[PDB]
Amino acid sequence: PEFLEDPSVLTKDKLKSELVANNVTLPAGEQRKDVYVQLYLQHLTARNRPPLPAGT
């Protein structure tokens, strides 16, 4: 399940439109305060942040 491991090009509303499909409830509507951004790195922790440079 790949997800925005680095949501710095979407916004505070896309990272959310995804979190939903990625097993994550959505609290406020507009955007509490970078809640969906931190939220993302919280449960999603940017799963594979590193693209793996081929070095095991």
UniProtKB/Swiss-Prot annotation:
PTM sites of type Phosphothreonine: T56
Disulfide-bonded cysteines: none
Protein name: Thymopoietin
Lineage: Eukaryota, Metazoa, Chordata, Craniata, Vertebrata
Domain of life: Eukaryota
Boundaries of every LEM-like domain copy: 4-47
Naturally occurring in which organism (per UniProt): Homo sapiens (Human)
